[PDB]
Amino acid sequence: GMTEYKLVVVGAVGVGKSALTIQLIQNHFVDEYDPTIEDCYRKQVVIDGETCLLDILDTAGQEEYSAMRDQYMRTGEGFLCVFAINNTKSFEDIHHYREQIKRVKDSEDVPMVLVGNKSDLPSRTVDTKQAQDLARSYGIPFIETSAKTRQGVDDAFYTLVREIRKHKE
């Protein structure tokens, strides 16, 4: 039948996880989404000629490591690790997110995509070369996005699906 891919969007509070997810699903930019609210979304799409269902969790709390929460995150098949290009700390947080994901999945090979969001901004503090190099060190794609303009949004999620497909093959 039609495969369902469980995707989890993670990253520091304020990087644009909710805005990215809502942009993917609803095709508009929500700029004041409650930072504490977690929700999930589904969307049927065709990727490389194969129809599939995306089941996406937009995470709120990024630091609750209960046994329940770990097992919940464990259901995730692919992770979008998002930072904001104007917050260096959010970029330096990525290392911890990847370590946590590897721990939770009990695997050194977890489908992941690094996402540098807010690319529409006229200023940035995270050099694109830094992010490219980090992504290469992890062996994962790097995608620049703007939830505001839609730039890279479909690309980020669909690239993650493609990463899951390769892993499962």
Ligand X SMILES: Nc1nc2c(ncn2[C@@H]2O[C@H](COP(=O)(O)OP(=O)(O)O)[C@@H](O)[C@H]2O)c(=O)[nH]1
Ligand Y SMILES: SCc1nc2ccccc2[nH]1
Interface positions with ligand X (CB under 6 A): 13-19, 31, 33, 35, 117-118, 120-121, 146-148
Distance CA 83, CA 131 (A): 10
- The count of chain residues that interact with ligand Y, using the rule CB under 6 A, is 7
Cross-strand bridge partners of residue 10: 81
151 binds ligand LX6 (CB under 6 A): no
Does residue 43 interact with ligand Y by CB under 6 A?
no
Q: Minimum distance between the CB of residue 35 and Mg ion, rounded to whole angstroms? A: 5
Note whether 75 binds ligand Y by CB under 6 A: yes
Shorter beta-carbon distance to ligand X: residue 19 or 140: 19
What token pair was written down for 157?
A: 């999620």
Q: Does 99 bind ligand LX6 (CB under 6 A)?
A: no
Q: State the Cα–Cα distance between residues 101 and 37, nearest whole angstrom.
A: 21
- Do residues 164 and 5 lie in contact, with contact meaning Cβ atoms separated by under 8 Å? yes
Query: Contacts with Mg ion in 1-60 (CB under 5 A)?
Result: 17-18
Q: Which two tokens stand for residue 73?
A: 């995150």
H/E run at residue 134: helix 128-138
61 interface partner picked from ligand LX6, ligand X, Mg ion, none, CB below 5 to 8 A per type? ligand LX6
CB of 21 to Mg ion, least distance (A): 8
Helix (H, G, I), strand (E, B) or coil at 49: coil
